[PDB]
Each structure stands twice: as structure tokens, then as C-alpha cells.
Design a protein around this ligand. Structure first.
Ligand SMILES: O=C(Cc1ccccc1)Nc1nnc(OC2CN(c3nnc(NC(=O)Cc4ccccc4)s3)C2)s1
Ligand SMILES: O=C(Cc1ccccc1)Nc1nnc(OC2CN(c3nnc(NC(=O)Cc4ccccc4)s3)C2)s1
Lengths: 410, 402, 409, 409
């Protein structure tokens, strides 16, 4: 036997040769993009042969084997329906219906407290999916950059835990939701911020990362980390959002001074500098597509699904998912945990970073926010998604009534 | 081909005939008990055969088929290693090590309002069973009954109705003192005020004796008809010592928290009865396993709770099940669990197993010292944490694998 | 000289004899009522003289001395303008204006959680004054009985402090207002109710009075005490209000069980009986007139101004006034202390028991309550009263701007 | 007759002439000091005379009249026992015993969070009295300057109410104590600081004074105001304390940014400059003697007793006294109101500014603080002071048991 040959026969369907377009089309139907970083050698060899061979455009068992040899494992998993969602085409058509249904929820108000948030249209709405196997889908405004804002909080907490361990980080920040009106206190009674997902907690976490080096390096370090989480897709920076965040951060300066007086930072912290670093981190830009890969990295135990690279330790990923479960959605976190049961994090630019553990990551984005600060369409989408699929953390994988399970076939 | 014969040959060893003891020994090794209610027909057929011919007592291909035909599917899944934990005996030896390690945590004080009793029982979603320690000693559910009666109410009345009367969130680590949240509902079903309201929703219109019978019948189904009892002694002491519960009851009454037509004073008495319901570790593990198994009881196959009832209960055990330790427990253990003052910890590993840990000595937060220690070790050892990853899990063992 | 004689000359006005009506009219103008218990011998002797002497109706120096001799000390202070408010007639005409101004404030809702409060007309409005010298004035519906309700809380706290002392009583109840939303908590962090003026605190205080004896005695004992505080004017009991208070007291039973579980009562307390005693104390009846005398006893350091009897210890009175100042007006207590600056206690029946220390006591009553549970007209009356007179706790007695001071001439 | 004449004879004792020293000793006997600003013309005349006739040094009726005539009203009133405390010498010996009793309470910890407070000896202890008539007494370390710190909060709140009125000022700050652990919150539910006596409230109040003008003038204005309040006795500034307060005021900066974001300041406020002004105000220095005069201005309805000058409106003084009663002693405020019943304000330097309305002002100073931030010796002195005298706000002026009343003879 031979695996490249075994693939060859499955796609050849009996003909002597496989047209290249027929291989490309079958590959995309699995959900992979041809630009997948794990498929580069196969795509390079295909492009090279379609130069050497303008006598084609067809691959015999020879030529096919030459192209797929270096990525044969992933291609076999792709073609033998071994991905976490085997019938990805059916699933993306469900994603699209959920998208269109959320598209009609027109309520909410865009964040307008700084000019670069009232700038974004209330009609932008995009959702991107990235499975733990790298299968991709996007519908709507998914290549429009927007700032992570508080969607960055779980990402930088994961970085802190990855670099420093659970015990160190939670010497400085708690691990629990505060309560439906302790949402207003900066500190719990151990004089720690309640958890990493609130502003006082995120400010302390920001103060833990890459200590001793300057802010430009700290930022480069977190940015390269975000690059790996996103499989090197778009991670950027909105200096416009940064200038306004630093001009409108009286509440954060109030938090910073409160934390300083209560001795909440690591020894030797320049609190005013940390606030500026914190302001920078909330102005980091993503698209729905690149952010979906970040969420998928968290869905995938800390491995980036489109590169195969280990980005975060399991401990960092587990802790981050645990705190997104209970603290990720502002005052809606309890209701969201109950009704959706998925680790998620919202931001004031309208993003919702969503993790379906072991299945996929998602970024939902629509700027108009509800009274709690969460994107109206994203929240609607996340309720619909769990209504349709047995993705709720406490759905059962065997008995799930009439929910669809996209991990199954028939 | 044929499934009974193929099963016969896998057990046959090539040999012509199967000793009956060899089949029992092979069956017990899968984790199933011979008393399993779903194997009743097969054990019935074996009992009849083990009279017919005692110069055997050997099952030829014909006679083996005679006994196993009506349970062949369940027996095949057991023998073809298809259960949720395939190498079940390896797993139970890990349970034993975990048990012995918690056995050395002697601290804590029994609720006094025995310190050397300690048992853990496992029931997987496929009905594989294991116990270590004092697992057939009855004890009262106390607050371990709160998720069970909440599931019953959601099962019979739906989420929307039940949560007109009770919230669905933890209160906060010093809002644990308030009976009502901001909408004048108790915070969640896992606190006493919430459980009192939930008690007032079950089987309205009938008297408390019927209500109790109905809850007992429901708990029987949850436990696949294993031990469910009632401790009148605990009931009397709970009711003579329930000043705080009367305080909660009167507070709820004044604040219009009960369904219209509620006799609050009677509900408190019903409530005292429910916390005095008795289980063992073994029967309670089946109850937990029903919650682990989407509401189907694993040793009978019966649909006991709606998926909605089970999901809601697991969600609220995640965040509210372990008193002031609920947040730390959700973070560090990541499993839906519920503790009780008699020393019980009802533990659910969704899609895998249910467990009851029982050890009366409680820590400062009211949770059984040994149980809490066991639950930390268990997730430290296996990738059972709610937010462990199933593919990349570092050095943890995954008992679902081979 | 002679005290009766010189007083005789002060009233005689050169005339040889004093008409009896001329003496009575001058006596009433000081603010005393002829029925004042400290004037009994003089009034009995006057009535007797108008029988023996239907050849009158005039009192010569001999006869005037015969009638006023045994109350000459009080009568001299009355007639020599020595009372705390010398020009009482002027003062009561201000009280009347204040009354009429508050009468036009028609807002508020009569308490209706029990039928005996809901029946009370929203248009009843009465204010009664009793000075620390026993001078009296009333305008409006001042002889209509109503239940003290929470106006009894400072009185029973005073009884407890009088009988048991500050230190003992405040082992069981604090001495501070709770804060603008610790009003829903039954206990402060030391597991005591915050102060005696909240329900939980009053229930605990109720549990301290005459421990060991049964409720009928306890009630008689407290009633004896209120009688003296009111100079034996009307103190009654509304059994109808008691039956309704006890059948609808879920929150008080919730408080009762919480306190028992937290061991807030003295050892040997029958908590459910204490709740029953507590409901009885809230159903005790007064009028504006009689309750004003109770307030005046508190205004007068524990002596009842119309009998001269010592009723409460100064320690009991100071403590009670201190806590009415800061905790007497429900959630309005801080605003009331700031703007009115007087020890006061409201109740759900519309009463406001009001104390101007060293000056007078008042009961204001009008059933309609505002959102905080305080009588709309009483609250309006009490603001106006301090706007007009330098009675605020922290008004100055020497420099008080445009305010009137009724203690001066 | 003649007022200078009668007075001369009362001091003359029938004798021919009054030696000047005998008049001075007699005057101090009333409690007034010879440096009293209202006695300047008389002391000027005495100084001129103590040159003319150094064959003396004695004043005949003519010469005495020459000296005392322009201060005759105050001098008679002093010499005829007409002051608020007639037997002032008796009173100061009670103060001395109270002083000596508190001197034996050596506990407490000197504030050390800035090096200017840790410099102060734990053994410094001073008490100064100034009555509403200007009678003066001091025992201990009463001319050692220390900073007001939070004792300034009532003074600047009084200024703000005096300049802007009650209604405007309390658009920005509440009028109530918060509760014993809403003490960690910066704002009440109306997004106002709870009261002017907490840091958040004092910071907002600072932002109201002389708006629109820069900080240097604002500070000058407050210093002139404090000068009037102290009858021009010692008011200074500790720049060292100011520098330390401002580099270590993280919680105050946290409060400032919180108030700014919640829009708690008047339109056009530079919050960071207000914090700087606020730190300056807490570094203003007094002695026990001068601060006692400021307290006496508050005891005297806004008139400074040693100058006769109107300094604050009665409204400003009433409000400040009201909020010192309930909010002036940090977490001890409720206990202090209950047990001492006097408006007071403590500060971290160990000062307690104490007001007995209509009677006297006091400054107590001893750096060692208790766990709540109040001076251990000051707190002890203030309890003893009211255990001894019927100065409690709700003591009765007529029936006060065995307490001493220094207003009586
Ligand atoms: O005092 C202590 C100890 C302590 C006291 C003070 C400081 C620290 C510690 N522990 C006590 N625990 N219970 C008490 O008596 C109650 C049973 N009570 C309920 N009252 N109100 C409820 N529901 C709402 O108010 C709605 C709501 C409004 C705002 C926020 C949240 C909810 S539930 C009060 S005292
Ligand atoms: O000290 C601790 C430790 C502790 C935690 C839990 C229990 C006990 C002890 N925790 C913190 N304490 N202060 C903090 O920084 C703040 C500046 N803050 C303000 N937040 N909110 C304000 N104003 C209103 O909310 C309106 C309002 C609404 C309802 C009631 C009262 C007021 S002012 C918080 S964190």
C-alpha cells in the first residue's frame, strides 16, 4: 500500500488522472483553505507543476504523490472526513443561517465615548469560524479591522499564566466572578481584583507581563504572541483608538491609583506606565478571521490550528476558558454561562471572542452594544448557536434531544 | 455471521465450551455488575441453566447464545471495549490510589448541629461500577438533594417557570448572606433560600405525603432503583433546629416569593424531609451518573430527566454547588458538584461518569475535607476538568483512551 | 411681704379683689390648663369658693391666698413669665400658622397593609405642644386616638435603659444608623441590630424589658410607664390593630427567627411570645395631646412636665434622644437630622413624636405617609418649625439670624 | 450713676485707688487674657499710663475710667460673672484634672505614613478652651504648631456654605454618614460623596471654594478666612507636610480621578490642581490655642468670640456642626455621637476640634492615634469631659443628675 496512493484512488474515482481543480475543490470542501500554512509545500509543488506542466492540467498517481507527499497526513485527515466537523459544508450553511437571523436584530448603540468607536458602522456584522483542525468559514464583514478592546483580556491573561504560572498570577488577581453588584468594586476582600476579565484585574495582569523591559518591548512581545495565536493572520494596532483611550481613561487612572495605594502591583511597577501599556493592548486590532484563529487556539489546548504550533500551555488555556465561562460578558456573564455555556469574551468595539472547547473558535463582531456592553447581534448569534447545536458546556454528547451535533455524520 | 457467536468466540479462546464462571469473571472486568438491571434477562437465563446440567457447567455456542441473546448488544459493547472508559480496571486502580490518598486527610469536623467513614463510588454513563471504602452505609443527601429536586422541577415545569421564582447565578462571596437578589428571587437553586423556593414548585396541589412519594419515585429512577431511604432522626433534628430556615421561609413569604397558594410552613417541613432523604455512595453515584448521561439512567436505560433539566442542573452545580468554595472549585476542579453537610459530594463528569464521595468531617466552608481532596486529585490526574482539552492535555491521563 | 400677696397685686391691678374669671383667663394665657394636675388644690379651692360664695364672684387678698397657696410656686413662675416660653400666646399663633400651612400639603398615602390603618381619613391632621413647664396647645384633630406604631420604639428603649442601664441594653442592640442601604440587613457585623429604632432592634429591646415575667405583666408594666410619661392622659390599646399586626407580620417573624438563630435574645427568651408582645406595644393608642406630654417628658430630662414626677433616668432620656436624632425617621433620618435637627420618631399611623430638648414635646399626626413612611404633613410641619424658630440642634442661642426664639421676649 | 464708676468700686473694695496689677489679676480671673483684641484700647491706655506716673502704679477713679471706658461693656460683663462660665477658675481646674487623667493614657500609634507626622513626639498633649465669650485656658503643649489635616474639612465646608449656600454646596456632596462599611465607597447612590467630612467629600468641597480664581489666591482666601476664624491667632503652613502628602496621596488621586470620571466636580474644574489645593489645606498649621478659637467661632454661631467679628453665616455653622456630629470622627462617629454628643472633627496629626455649642470651642492635640485614626488622649478627654459636665447634646439643662454644669453658680 501507500497513503498518497490511497488518497489518489479516493479522489481519482477510477479515472487514470485527477484534474488539479478537482483536487482543489475537494480540498476546500473539507473546510481547509489552500493558503493553510500546513499545506504550503503541497500548494507550492502544485503551483510549480502547473508551470513545468502547461501540458495538463492533470495529475497521475506519480504527480499527485509528488505534490501531496509532505502534507499527506493532514490531507488524509481532511479527505477521510476525520476533522472535528466532518460535513463542514452543511455546518457552514447552518452558520450562515444563524448569521442572517442575527443580522435582523438592529437594536443596540455603538460605543461612542471616543471618536474611533462611533466611527464604526452599526450595520457591520461578521462571524468567522476556525475549527481545531483549521477549517475556516466567514460570513459578513469579517476582514474589517476592529480593536480587541476587552477581548484582549483573556489573551493577555493566558500569556501571563503561560509565562508565570497559575500560582504567581493569582497571587495578584482572583479567580471568581464578583457578584451582580460587586461589579462596581475594584478589589475583593483579599485586596485583589476579582478576576482577570474586569478592568482592575486586567490592569494588574498587564503589570505582570515581561516585567523589567520597557513598554515598546512588552508590546512587541505580546504582539508576537498574538501573531502565533492567530497563525500570523492580521494583528494590528489602532493608534487613533489608543490616543482616545489614553485621553478618556479617568476610570482606569482611578483604578491604577487605587491599585497602587493597595499594593496590588508587583514590586517595582510604574503604574502610570502600565496604564499606557494597558491602553495600547486595548487598541490592538484584529479582523473576525484572524481573531477566530486566536479563539481556535484556545479551543485547541493552546496549539494554533492552522500552524500546528504550541502557543500557550494547557494550564494557561484551561484557566482562561474557566474565567471566560464565568466572567467574560460583563454583567451578562451569569446569564450567558447558564443559557449559552460557552467561554466567551466581549469588547466595547462589538467583538465577541467565542470558544467551543475541542471544536472551534469564533470571533463575532457587530459594533452596536446592548445596555450591558455586549454586541446585540453577537449575543443573539451565541444563543442561536447553542439552541441549534449541542455545544453548551453541559449539553450531553450522546443524548441531546433535537439539537444538531456537527461532530457526527448520520 | 451472528453477534452472539462472534461474542462466543472472543470469550471462547478457540476452546469448545465456556465455563460459566469464566463468563462472569470476564463480564465483571468490563466494569458491569452481574446485578445490572439491563442484564436481567441474561442472568435469568443463566439461573435457569445453572440448574439444568451440573455436570458442566459449560456453555456451548448454542447454550451461550441461549443466555446472551436478549442482551447481546450491551454485552458486545462491554466485551468489544466500547464503554466510555475501555480499560475500566486500570481506571478503578487509579480511583483506589486517589481514595487512599484522601484517606490520609484526617482534618475537618463532622457537622454536629463518624469521622472515620470514607467512601467513593463511581458509575459511568455506561453503567460500569466501582466502589472503595464505606460505600453501602446510608447517609442523608442534605444539600446534595438540591440539584436533584431542582432538576425534577425543571423537568416537570420547564426552565422559564422555575426561574420566575429562582435566579440562575452565584451571588458573590459575601452576598452569600442575602436571601434574595436584586429582583427579590433567591440567587440560585443551590442556596437554601433557592432550594426552599424550588421545593415549593414540585407537585403543587397534592399534600406533602404525596409530594414526598413522588420525589422518592423520581430519585428511585435516578438511582436505577438502588438504595434511597429516609432518616426520621435527621428529619426531627433538622426541623427542631431550623430557625434559620424558618427565617428564610418567612422572609420569602413576606416578599411574595412562593407560587400562589403555598403553605410556607408546610413547605419547610417538606424541605426538611428532602434533606433527610438517605442514599449510599453507590446509589448516589448512579444518580450523579444519570446527570452525567443527559438524563438517562445508565444501569436501566430509562429516560429520567429532560436534557434541559440536566443541563440547567449541571450549569448551576458548576458555579453554585460547593458553598463559598464554589468559585475556587469551578476554577481548580472544573466539575459540576454538590456538597452536603453529612459529608457528601455528588460529582458529575459530563459524558463520562457520576460519583458520590462521602466523608462526614467538613472543612471551614462546609465541604467534606476528604471529598474535596479527592476531587482535586482526580482532575489533577485525569483530563476531566471542564476546560481541559481532549487532544492536548499535557501529562494528565485520559481514561477514555486505550 | 408674701408670695401669694405680691402675686395677688400683680393680677389685682389696683382693684381690691380679683374676679375669678379674670384669674382663670390670666392663668390660661400662660399656657397652663386649669386641669393641670399640679394645680388641683388651687382649682378645687376655687370651685369650692364658688359654692360657699355665690355672693361673688370676687376674691379678695384673703381668699386668693386661700386658693393659690398650695400651688403658689408654680403659679408665680407662670405669672412672672418664668416659663420656658414666656409669650406662649404669640407662640401658639405661630404654631397655628405652621399648622395651616401644612394642612395644604395634601400628598401621601395612608398605610393600608392592615385594615385598621387604611380606615383612617387622609384629612385628619393634628399637632399638640407640651412645654417642659406643662404649657399646652393643640390645633386640629388632637383628641383622635391612633396607634403609636413605631413611635413606641424610643419609649420602650427608654424603659429598657432606665431599668437596665446603657451598657447592658447595648450588648444586644447597637447605637448607630445603618447606612443608606444597610436598611435591609437585620444585623450589623457584630450580629446586633443596628440601633433600637429599626424593627429588629426594637424586637430585641422588647425582649429585654421585665424578663422572666409573662406578657400580661410586661404589658401592664409598660403601660404603667407610658401613663406616667403622659401625665396619666389617654394611653389606650387597639386590639383590632394588634390582631391585624400579628396575622400579617411575616417580616417580623422572619426577623424573629433570624435573631433567635443568631442568639440575639437573652437566654431564656420565648421569641414567638416576644413577637406577640412586640405587636401589642405597636398597637398602644395615644392622642396628639397625650403623646405630646410623653415627648415633653423626654424634652424635660425624664420628668413629666404636668405632674412633676420623675419617670425616666437622665441616662435613659439622653440615649433615647440621641438615637431618635439619628435613626428616628426611617431612610429620611439623615436628611431630617441635617435640616430639622430634632430628635423625632415616626410611625406608620402618621404620628411624629417630636422633642425640642429643654423646650417642648410635640406629637404631630396625619395618616398620609410619603414614600419613606413618614407623615407628609408632619415632615412639612417640622421643616417649617425649624425654619421659623431657632430650635435646630445646632442653631445658636445667641446668633440665629432672622429666626424667632420663643424663649425670649 | 456710671458704668465705669460702679465697676471701679466693685474692684476698689472701698479702697482709695486700684493698683494696676490688682486690676490685671482680677481681669485674668474672669478668664479673659490681657491680649484679648476687644480689650486693646484698654490695654493701650494702661500702657500709656504705665509711663506717665511711675510714682504709682495706681489708678484713681478718674484714671481707671480713662483706661476702661472704651471696653466698659465687656469688662463689666466679665467682672459681674455674666460670661457663659461664671466661675471659670473652678472650670479650668476641672479641665486640668481631665487633662491629667488623659495624660495617663499612653497608648496609640503616631501616624507615620509621612515623615512629618512620625517626627512628632508621642508625649505631646495639649488642650485649649475658648468660650463663646472669649475666656481662655490651656494646659499642656498648646503653642506647638501641628497641621489640621482632616480637622480642616469642617472649616472649608463652612467656608463653602458661607459663600455659596447650603443648596448649592449639597448639589455636590451629601449630608449623611455612609454606614460602617460603605466607608470604603467614594460615592453614595446619587453619585455624590456621602458628606464633606470624608476625603472624597472634602475633595469635592475644595473644588467649590472661590471657583475661577487660581490656587494661590484660593489658598490666600482660605488663610484669611481661617485668620478671621481664629481671631488672628496662629495660622501657618507646613510645606514639608504638603510635599509628603502630595507624593504619597495615591488614594486621594484615586478618589480624584473617580470623582472626575463620575462628573462630581463643578464645570471647569482642574481636578489635579484641586488635589494640590486639597493637600495644601491639610497642611495648614495651628496650635491648640488658635484652633480652639476657630472651634469657639463655631460654638458661637459664626462670630469669633475674641474679636466680635462675624465670620460665618449661621447657616454655615449649623450645617458644619450637624455634619461634625455624625461624620467627624471616622468610623468612631456613631459611638462618639452616642457617648459624647458633641460636634467634633479629628485629624491624623492627633488633633480633635471640639465644639460645645453656645459654650466653648476646644482643640485637643496628642499625636498617638487609636486603630480608627483618632487621638487616644483626645478621645479619652472628650468622654471624661461629658461624663463630668452636662455638655452632651441631649443632656437636659434642668435635670442632669449628678453632672456638673459650668454655666451655673
Ligand atoms: O449582616 C450580616 C453581616 C454583615 C453586616 C454588615 C456588613 C458586613 C457583614 N449578614 C446578614 N445577612 N442577612 C441579614 O438579614 C437579612 C436577610 N436579608 C436580605 N435583605 N435583602 C435581600 N435582598 C435585597 O436586598 C435585594 C438586593 C439589593 C442590593 C444588593 C443585593 C440584593 S436579602 C437581610 S444580616
Ligand atoms: O474594599 C474592598 C474590600 C471589600 C470587598 C467586599 C466586601 C467588603 C470589603 N473593596 C473595594 N472598596 N472600594 C473600592 O474602590 C472603589 C471606589 N468605589 C465606589 N464604588 N461605588 C461607589 N458608589 C456607588 O456604588 C453607589 C452605591 C450603590 C449602592 C450602595 C451604595 C452606593 S464608590 C469602589 S474596591
Amino acid at each position: 500500500p501507500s497513503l498518497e496512493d490511497l488518497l489518489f484512488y479516493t479522489i481519482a474515482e477510477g479515472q487514470e488522472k485527477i484534474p488539479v481543480h478537482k483536487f482543489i475543490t475537494a480540498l476546500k470542501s473539507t473546510g481547509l483553505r489552500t493558503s493553510d500554512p500546513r499545506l504550503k509545500e503541497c500548494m507550492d509543488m502544485l503551483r510549480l507543476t502547473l508551470q513545468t506542466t502547461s501540458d495538463g492540467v492533470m495529475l497521475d498517481k506519480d504527480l499527485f504523490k509528488k505534490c501531496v507527499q509532505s502534507n499527506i497526513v493532514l490531507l488524509t485527515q481532511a479527505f477521510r472526513r476525520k476533522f472535528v466537523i466532518p460535513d463542514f459544508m452543511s455546518f457552514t450553511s447552518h452558520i450562515d443561517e444563524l448569521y442572517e437571523s442575527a443580522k435582523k436584530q438592529s437594536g443596540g448603540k455603538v460605543a461612542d465615548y471616543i471618536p474611533q468607536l462611533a466611527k464604526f458602522s452599526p450595520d457591520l456584522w461578521g462571524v468567522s469560524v476556525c475549527t481545531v483542525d483549521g477549517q475556516r468559514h466567514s460570513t459578513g464583514d469579517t476582514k474589517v479591522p476592529f480593536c480587541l478592546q476587552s477581548c484582549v483580556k483573556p489573551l493577555k491573561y493566558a500569556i501571563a499564566v503561560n509565562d508565570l504560572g497559575t500560582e504567581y498570577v493569582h497571587r495578584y488577581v482572583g479567580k471568581e466572578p464578583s457578584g451582580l453588584r460587586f461589579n462596581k468594586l475594584f478589589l475583593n476582600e483579599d485586596d485583589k481584583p476579582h478576576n482577570p476579565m474586569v478592568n482592575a484585574g486586567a490592569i494588574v495582569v498587564t503589570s505582570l507581563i515581561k516585567q523589567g523591559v520597557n513598554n515598546a518591548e512588552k508590546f512587541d512581545y505580546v504582539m508576537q504572541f498574538l501573531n502565533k495565536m492567530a497563525g500570523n493572520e492580521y494583528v494590528g494596532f489602532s493608534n487613533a483608538t489608543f490616543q482616545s483611550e489614553r485621553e478618556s481613561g479617568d476610570r482606569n487612572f482611578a483604578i491604577g491609583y487605587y491599585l497602587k495605594e493597595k499594593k496590588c502591583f508587583p514590586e517595582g511597577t510604574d503604574m502610570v506606565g502600565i496604564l499606557d501599556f494597558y491602553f495600547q493592548l486595548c487598541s490592538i486590532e484584529v479582523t473576525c478571521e484572524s481573531a477566530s484563529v486566536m479563539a481556535a487556539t484556545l479551543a485547541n489546548g493552546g496549539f494554533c490550528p492552522i500552524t500546528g504550533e504550541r502557543v500557550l500551555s494547557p494550564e494557561a488555556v484551561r484557566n482562561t476558558l474557566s474565567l471566560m465561562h464565568s466572567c467574560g460578558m460583563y454583567d451578562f456573564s451569569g446569564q450567558f454561562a447558564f443559557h449559552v455555556g460557552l467561554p466567551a469574551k466581549s469588547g466595547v468595539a462589538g467583538g465577541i471572542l467565542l470558544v467551543v472547547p475541542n471544536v472551534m473558535g469564533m470571533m463575532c463582531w457587530s459594533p452596536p452594544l446592548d445596555k450591558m456592553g455586549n454586541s446585540v447581534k453577537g449575543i443573539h448569534f451565541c444563543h442561536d448557536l447553542v439552541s441549534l447545536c449541542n455545544f453548551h458546556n453541559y449539553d450531553n454528547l450522546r443524548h441531546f434531544a433535537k439539537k444538531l451535533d456537527p461532530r457526527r455524520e448520520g
